[PDB]
Design a protein around this ligand. Structure first.
Ligand SMILES: [Mg+2]
Lengths: 44, 76, 102, 62, 88
RNA sequence: GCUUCGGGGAGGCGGCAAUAUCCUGUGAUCCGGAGAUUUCUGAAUGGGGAAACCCACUUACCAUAAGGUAGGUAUCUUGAAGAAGCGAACGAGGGGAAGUGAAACAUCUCAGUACCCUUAGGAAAAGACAUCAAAUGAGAUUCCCCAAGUAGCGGCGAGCGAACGGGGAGAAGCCGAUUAAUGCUAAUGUAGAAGAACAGCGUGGGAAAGCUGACCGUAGUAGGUGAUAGUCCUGUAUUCGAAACAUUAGCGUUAACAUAUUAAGUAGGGCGGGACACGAGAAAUCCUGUCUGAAGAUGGGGGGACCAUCCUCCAAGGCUAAAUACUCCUGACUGACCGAUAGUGAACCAGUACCGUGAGGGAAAGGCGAAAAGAACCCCUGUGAGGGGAG
RNA sequence: CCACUGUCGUUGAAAAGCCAGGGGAUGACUUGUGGAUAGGGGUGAAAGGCUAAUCAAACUCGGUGAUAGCUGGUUCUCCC
RNA sequence: GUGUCGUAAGGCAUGCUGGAGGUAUCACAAGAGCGAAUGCUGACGUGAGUAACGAUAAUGCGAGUGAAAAGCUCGCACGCCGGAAGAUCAAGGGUUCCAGUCCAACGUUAAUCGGGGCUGGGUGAGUCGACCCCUAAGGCGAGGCCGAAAGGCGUAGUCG
RNA sequence: GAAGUGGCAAAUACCAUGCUUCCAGGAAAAGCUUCUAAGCGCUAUAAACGAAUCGUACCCUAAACCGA
């Protein structure tokens, strides 16, 4: 049956992407937190 | 924002206190009003968002004194 | 460092203690001295490159503190010291006597 | 080799750099076609190009 | 400028497709700089091979392959190649 | 990786990780100072955008074709100069929980804590009396030890909890105790240099251990080296170097900003809140949303309701070092701290694999040998795996 | 597109299916792509349904080592 | 492992293994003693060589290669789909595509085969699509309005 | 080294963004054609030269996507 993840690149990059993170103060805090943890993947 | 230009009055925080002494956070807002002040030195009306205390300060000190203080303060 | 490739040394520790040879290589703390510390290597033959293969006998690096420079006069193990001449030239010098040679 | 280039003027340094560019192209083509046995030459040509551009930068700055 | 055209051609392509393209149509296959246009490839070919005329340049980007070596997963560089048609 | 200036003196072209072509006393590799180059994304700044992409305008020059080189073009503030963004903790400020405790729970507690937001500096803040005291008075601020779990506050419950003063650290008072450069003089740091003295014999794979006898010591409990070394190596004690750049001070000078002249919408008051250890209380004192509103030195503020007397001090201008708080970092040193299920989550290609749309969660996994001397060759087998010989 | 009945399956082929039948099938229809509404909030032809296999208050992190008059466990030896 | 000593916790000696550290005594300090916590991590049992090997569309034989062939290749025959189980895409994936070579692991068996390993190759546009010009919903939004702060809204526009 | 043209049948494709009816009354903007404003090139005929960049393999009712 239909499952929860239905991938779409535009939708992924528009809800979770780098510019979407940088558009908000809270998204920039997400990025600051990911960089402080040292993640090799900042954004999808 | 809800800030008086000439006096600096802005919202205060405080408590609503019930008779049973229950505390709730509340705000105290300034008595802010729009008023067009006549300025002879410029022959014009300038509209300020001002408190009642600021209007009294206009009454005592003059619109010219208050206006030069606002201009020194910045926004004009 | 105090021993460089070319000079004749004598091994003062190890299985070849006593024998002398001339230095071939100094990597950092190891030293290769010809005719000393001979290991037997089982070399698998190679087709592409030019090596043949067999049971070879080659010298192995030993620790540089296991050898000493050989005094040309006294023919005994010696230490090295440095002498800055009046000309400003730095020369190795035998610790026992002091002659500039080696 | 750097003393051989520091005496040269900018006008001939530029032309020598262009010669080195053409040289690099031909080394690359010979490398791809398997005709350059002495493979140490490509690095020395690249570093000669770097030296020429450094000297050109110096002689143009002042 | 005449120093950018020396970097356009990174080297020829030697393969069966390249060999038979050369035999049948006399067309040269080059690995070219990742940023070279068809006009740049045309100018570079005509300058580095004196006496030839370019009719057509066909370009394509080929993605590099993933080749896990030892313990690591790594990938080869992408590259661009040009099919260059020359005057017969 | 390019240039240069210093160091250094025989090897070297980063690791896994070797191989090849080679470089190197015409001084390489390497180390320290300076410079040059420095794609694209990202504050990202020419416009736009699903980051690492798409699309431009314009000036000058060159080309003749469909371009190339060097620039310019965001916004805001201030009158060309600045700002932006990021990043530990500590500071100051604007907002501000609840779980919990009270053996329930609402006042109260938790706690002005967590968290959110703003913004500095090497510290910040505060600071020179409209402060206390009531003693023979003292004399700014901050921090520490006491005072003291006292006096108080408190459904007088649970709890909360001073001050005066004493002993210390540090001290300083001003009205320019500002900021940024540059230039001298001094010192430092950022590479380095020299640096003592052990042999014999036996055991042993190997000697540093054993036996015997020496030596150095301003250097003897360092790390290594084939077993445990003051005398084998690197070191240690000691003595020491700088072309260049940084930093710290002192001096001089410049250019930016600042330079009150004694303080009225102020003090005080009504109402509602808040802060004071103090929950409205007999409640001083501080702050202010709202409404008011003086005296102005023949005056005013405080001394815990309030009045009188007495003492004390002059608000409504600004500033001010130290003693205090901290650690993303640099250096030296230390540990009755751990030793691979421990210690960082992470000793290992770890914030990785893996899981999750995402925010986020989050591992496992060290050790041949002294040296690869990592087993030529032969045999079985499928040129496999694996083994048996040989070494 | 749906899901009325039954058998099967229930450590499944499957964390909701198969098979045989069943309903709607020009409509208040189904469906693609993009977008909007966010947690005491949303959305709901209303079942407290649904809001990423999570819903009478999502998820993640933090307060936080919440609290637990409750349950479990509590590691060497001998003497009184 | 063994012997021996003590009321016990335990001590002492010693053979074998091991190959570089240990520690008397007396003080001193504890991450100081484990069988249970449906405890935590790893390893390994029992179940048991048991159930199962994933659509009941289906296979037979002859050759080939190979260490080995029910499963690979070739051939003949048989069967199945055929509004698909054929073909072209979008989305998503990302080399899986093609050839050679290998068979440990992976493939629910074997494998000489493979979407597995390794090495090479392969994607060619003025016209197809994107980019580009244009706008929808909906975003962002010089100035503007609003709001303790953070921010919220919104014009021209600019994206989509 | 051959043939390659006649009948019939026939789409849900095309004419057709048409026609007819109905009510629930059916995107926008640009390209495009014209008109002028401020201000100070355009239309035909050709000839030569150009048209960049990115994608393109392969699966796609699937063993390559979402379901470990
Ligand atoms: Mg659900």
């Amino acid at each position: 049956m239909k499952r929860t993840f239905q991938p779409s690149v535009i939708k992924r990059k528009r809800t979770h992407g780098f510019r979407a993170r940088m558009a908000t103060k809270k998204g920039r805090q997400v990025l600051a937190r990911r960089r402080a943890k040292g993640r090799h993947r900042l954004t999808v | 924002s809800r800030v008086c230009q000439v006096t600096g009055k802005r919202p205060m925080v405080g408590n609503n206190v019930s008779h049973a002494n229950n505390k709730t956070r509340r705000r105290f807002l300034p008595n802010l009003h729009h008023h067009r002040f006549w300025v002879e030195s410029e022959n014009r009306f300038v509209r300020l968002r001002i408190s009642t205390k600021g209007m009294r300060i206009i009454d005592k000190l003059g619109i010219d004194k208050v206006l030069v203080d606002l201009r020194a303060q910045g926004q004009k | 460092s105090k021993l460089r490739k070319g000079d004749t040394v004598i091994v003062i520790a190890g299985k070849d203690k006593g024998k002398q040879g001339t230095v071939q290589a100094v990597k950092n703390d190891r030293i290769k001295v010809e005719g000393i510390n001979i290991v037997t290597k089982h070399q698998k033959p190679n087709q592409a490159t030019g090596v043949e293969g067999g049971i070879l006998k080659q010298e192995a690096f030993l620790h540089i503190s296991n050898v000493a420079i050989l005094n040309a006069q006294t023919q005994k193990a010696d230490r090295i010291t440095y002498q800055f001449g009046e000309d400003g030239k730095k020369q190795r010098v035998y610790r026992s006597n002091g002659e500039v040679v080696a | 080799k750097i003393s051989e280039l520091r005496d040269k003027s900018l006008e001939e340094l530029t032309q020598l750099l262009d010669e080195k560019q053409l040289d690099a192209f031909r080394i690359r083509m010979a490398k791809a076609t398997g005709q350059l046995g002495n493979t140490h030459e490509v690095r020395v040509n690249r570093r000669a190009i770097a030296q020429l551009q450094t000297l050109i930068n110096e002689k143009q700055r002042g | 400028n005449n120093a950018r055209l020396y970097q356009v051609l990174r080297g020829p392509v030697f393969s069966e497709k390249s060999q038979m393209l050369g035999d049948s149509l006399g067309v040269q296959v080059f690995k070219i700089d990742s940023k070279a246009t068809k006009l740049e490839v045309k100018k570079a070919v005509e300058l580095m091979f004196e006496g030839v005329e370019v009719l057509k340049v066909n370009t394509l980007n080929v993605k590099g392959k993933t080749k896990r070596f030892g313990k690591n997963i790594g990938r080869r560089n992408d590259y661009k190649k040009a099919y260059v048609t020359l005057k017969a």
